[PDB]
C-alpha cells in the first residue's frame, strides 16, 4: 500500500472517467459538499424504506 492524498486520488479517478483533473481542483469544495449530502441521505433512505 502506497499512500496518496485523498484529493489527488479523486483526481486520478476523475481522469479515469475521461474528465480532466483540473475539473476537480476547481470544484473541490462543491464536490465535497455533494458527497457529504449523499452519504447523509443514505442512512435516512435505508431507514424509511420498508
Amino acid at each position: 500500500a502506497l499512500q496518496i492524498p485523498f484529493p489527488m486520488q479523486m483526481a486520478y479517478r476523475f481522469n479515469g472517467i475521461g474528465v480532466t483533473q483540473n475539473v476537480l481542483y476547481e470544484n473541490q469544495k462543491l464536490i465535497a459538499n455533494q458527497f457529504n449530502s449523499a452519504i447523509g441521505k443514505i442512512q435516512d433512505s435505508l431507514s424509511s424504506t420498508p
Binding site: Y12, N22, Q28
Partner: protein, 56 residues
C-alpha cells in the same frame, strides 16, 4: 498531463505514477488552466519552455 509532481526536498519533477523516473518540469509535459488562486495547495516553481533556450 501524465504523472505526478514529486519533490525530493529541494527540487520538483514530474514522474509517471507507477515507476520512479524523474523529469524536468517543462512546457511540453504540463498544461495550463486559469489563474493560480482557486486551486488549494498550489506551489511555485519554474516551468522551463524549450523554445526559449534555443532562441531559433
Amino acid at each position: 498531463r501524465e504523472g505526478v509532481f514529486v519533490s525530493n526536498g529541494t527540487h520538483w519533477f514530474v514522474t509517471q505514477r507507477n515507476f520512479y523516473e524523474p523529469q524536468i518540469i517543462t512546457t511540453d509535459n504540463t498544461f495550463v488552466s486559469g489563474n493560480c488562486d482557486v486551486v488549494i495547495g498550489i506551489v511555485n516553481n519554474t516551468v522551463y519552455d524549450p523554445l526559449q533556450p534555443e532562441l531559433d
